[PDB]
């Protein structure tokens, strides 16, 4: 976009989302917390979207997520809801 075609103080939300997290007008992370539930257990656990550790449900002792390079990969059975 040409510089005079945009406002530096009122950038469109799409551009702000597309920008690097630190290069936005105000820094904001791309991570979030989620409520993950096992397939069979009613217990509900909070997990970081980019967890570096293998989160295990206390009740059934089952691994909910696996650390990766970026976002943690959840187990096939489990499902998540964005918490925020």
């Amino acid at each position: 976009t040409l510089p005079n075609d945009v406002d530096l103080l009122n950038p469109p939300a799409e551009l702000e989302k597309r920008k690097h997290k630190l290069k936005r007008l105000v820094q904001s992370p791309n991570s979030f917390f989620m409520d993950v539930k096992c397939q069979g257990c009613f217990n509900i656990t909070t997990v970081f979207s980019h967890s570096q550790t293998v989160v295990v449900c206390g009740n059934c002792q089952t691994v909910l997520c696996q650390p990766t390079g970026g976002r943690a990969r959840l187990t096939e059975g489990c499902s998540f809801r964005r918490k925020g």
Binding site: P3, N4, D7, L8, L9, L25, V26, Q27
Partner: protein, 129 residues
């Protein structure tokens, strides 16, 4: 590393004004930068500027009138007495009819004409015209 935030701000404004941009971004912000911008705005060399809070040093967006020929920092900040202002203006300003040298005196940050009026010396911060 970053040594003079004022230099970065003034250089960004100078480059943007040369390019013809209507707005420029200054990062990080500083109260010395804000005082310099207020001195510039007092004389019509810039438009409205807005400070953005990010729980950090901050950011400023400056409107550019197109009247700014060149704004610059002077480093190191030399001591300027009330009697050296004439020589400094001769060295730095294009003419005796317009242009300002910004000083930091014990009475505050001000242009050289006000420093002459109040008979206060200090240290040279920069210039603009």
């Amino acid at each position: 590393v970053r040594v003079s935030v004022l230099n970065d701000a003034l250089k960004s404004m100078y480059n943007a004004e040369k390019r013809g941009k209507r707005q420029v971004m200054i990062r990080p912000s500083s109260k010395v930068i804000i005082k310099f911008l207020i001195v510039m705005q007092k004389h019509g060399y810039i438009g409205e500027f807005e400070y953005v809070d990010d729980h950090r040093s901050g950011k400023i967006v400056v409107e550019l009138n197109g009247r700014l020929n060149k704004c610059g920092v002077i480093s190191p900040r030399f001591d300027v007495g009330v009697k050296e202002i004439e020589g400094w203006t001769a060295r730095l300003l294009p003419s005796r009819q317009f242009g300002y040298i910004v000083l930091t005196t014990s009475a505050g940050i001000m242009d050289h004409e006000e420093a002459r009026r109040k008979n206060v010396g200090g240290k040279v911060l920069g210039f603009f015209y």
